Symmetry: C5
Subunit: 47 residues, 5 copies
């Protein structure tokens, strides 16, 4: 629970480290947007 | 109180994590501008 | 003490959170620049 | 273990500090991508 | 003692806070680049 890092790439993609995993995707648009469920998993550990 | 993350997207929108929630909005232009009151809630928790 | 956050906006302005307040201004060019005295107070608390 | 800093350059390259060393490279695109194995070492300590 | 902050400006300059001092410079190109030996000191304390 909670992100360790949460930051943008210069194209506007949101990146986040959550439970040692790395995710990316376009940023959420509302509190109805389950961002983590639709984010792409781009790293399985070590972050 | 207190933000856990406070950062910019490349289009100039300010993003912030406050009390596990995610907020965005144009940055304040003066200390009369209550940013958190006018920011768009874009995540209800898990941040 | 020091800063809680210190980060750039995409237009090149340096932002900083210091003693719960939000500051912005052009980045310092030498150690003779008192950036905190020089920056614009854009938020009086809650940061 | 884990990263101490993880952030983007405006040229699109991902930078990270891991165990006091500095690395850069294209961001990972999947959890098969061993980013730290293929990243360019650009700093052997002090970070 | 490492860096407290390490981040880019949108023109590609790397900024870092180290022992409460603020440094800037082009990012290191390889592990043979002593960045902090050649970085510009732009803040002597308070960071
Ligand atoms: C910090 C880092 O590069 N972690 C990666 C991880 O994301 C990836 O899923 C795994 C693939 O084997 O390799 C590494 O552990
Ligand atoms: C980290 C993350 O994606 N959190 C979101 C939250 O912001 C959103 O309000 C909720 C919708 O049900 O889904 C997830 O919990
Ligand atoms: C986090 C946040 O938006 N803080 C603001 C503060 O910056 C501003 O000076 C004040 C104006 O009334 O309102 C809020 O407290
Ligand atoms: C913080 C910093 O500038 N560290 C560098 C290190 O990355 C580099 O590999 C070394 C070369 O001798 O010099 C310095 O220690
Ligand atoms: C956070 C900040 O602005 N620190 C500066 C420091 O960089 C500068 O060298 C000194 C010179 O007067 O003034 C301030 O203390």
């Amino acid at each position: 629970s909670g992100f360790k890092f949460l930051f943008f790439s210069p194209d506007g993609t949101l990146y986040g480290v959550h439970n040692d995993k790395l995710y990316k995707g376009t940023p959420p648009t509302s509190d109805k947007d389950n961002w983590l469920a639709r984010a792409t998993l781009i790293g399985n550990g070590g972050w």
